[PDB]
Design a protein around this ligand. Structure first.
Ligand SMILES: Nc1ncnc2c1ncn2[C@@H]1O[C@H](COP(=O)(O)OP(=O)(O)NP(=O)(O)O)[C@@H](O)[C@H]1O
Ligand SMILES: [Mg+2]
Ligand SMILES: [Mg+2]
Length: 232
């Protein structure tokens, strides 16, 4: 049956087999859940310190590459730059903090980002009751949850040399999920995707992001770059 020309639908390749992603759901440790609800539902004047906290975490994960090379010289062989990118997306109302640090394994996500008690949590909640500035969160071992000052949902995609790529996600409310991530491989490191609250969209603006990096994150020790989508 001779053909000279086919239409796109005719030569569309068959899909790759559908992948299964395993998902597990975990409750927050009780005092973490209480802290998240305090953070979400209280007015604070200095919410901009979330970014300091996330940049701090990335800088710590980058410093670990340096040191892990003393017990595993392999890492010296990676060609990846040690750096942080800040990626606002005004279309989707997200701010993404990307690093090429060590990343997290699946058990690191479960144990580090919600199921284990930080010993300062109760003290910090009492300091907040007594009127402390939210800025002091870092010093109490629970800085990651400052994300919820500005974000209604947080997704963390991460890949560690010793595990496969995983996605942690939570909209608070007492639980989070961890699910194998078979989508776009991100390479070693972590991406924290903040789905911003409607009244916190200032943190998509280039001037506002530059202002808070300069105010609170001047000793990262690694290049940080802000990607700005061209105005159409
Ligand atoms: N960007 C990241 N890369 C790798 N691990 C991370 C990252 N962000 C958070 N973590 C993990 O999450 C843990 C909790 O973070 P946080 O709540 O800021 O307390 P802390 O920085 O350890 N002091 C960290 O100890 C890391 O294990
Ligand atoms: Mg079709
Ligand atoms: Mg931290």
């Amino acid at each position: 049956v001779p053909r000279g020309s086919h239409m796109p639908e005719e030569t569309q390749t068959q899909d790759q087999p559908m992948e299964e992603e395993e998902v597990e759901t975990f409750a927050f440790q009780a005092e973490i859940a209480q802290l998240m609800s305090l953070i979400i539902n209280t007015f604070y004047s200095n919410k901009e310190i979330f970014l300091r906290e996330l940049i701090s975490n990335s800088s710590d994960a980058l410093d670990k590459i340096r040191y892990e090379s003393l017990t595993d010289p392999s890492k010296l062989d990676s060609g990846k730059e040690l750096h942080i990118n800040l990626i606002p997306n005004k279309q989707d109302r997200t701010l993404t903090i990307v690093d090429t640090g060590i990343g997290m394994t699946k058990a690191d996500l479960i144990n580090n980002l919600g199921t284990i008690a930080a010993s300062g949590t109760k003290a910090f909640m009492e300091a907040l009751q007594a009127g402390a500035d939210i800025s002091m969160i870092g010093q109490f071992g629970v800085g990651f949850y400052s994300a919820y000052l500005v974000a209604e949902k947080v997704t963390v995609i991460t890949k560690h040399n010793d595990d496969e790529q995983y996605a942690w996600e939570s909209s608070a409310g007492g639980s989070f999920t961890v699910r194998t991530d078979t989508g776009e491989p991100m390479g070693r490191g972590t991406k924290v995707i903040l789905h911003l609250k409607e009244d916190q969209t200032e943190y998509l603006e280039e001037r506002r992001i530059k202002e808070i990096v300069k105010k609170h994150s001047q000793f990262i020790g690694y290049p940080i770059t802000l990607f700005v989508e061209k105005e159409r």
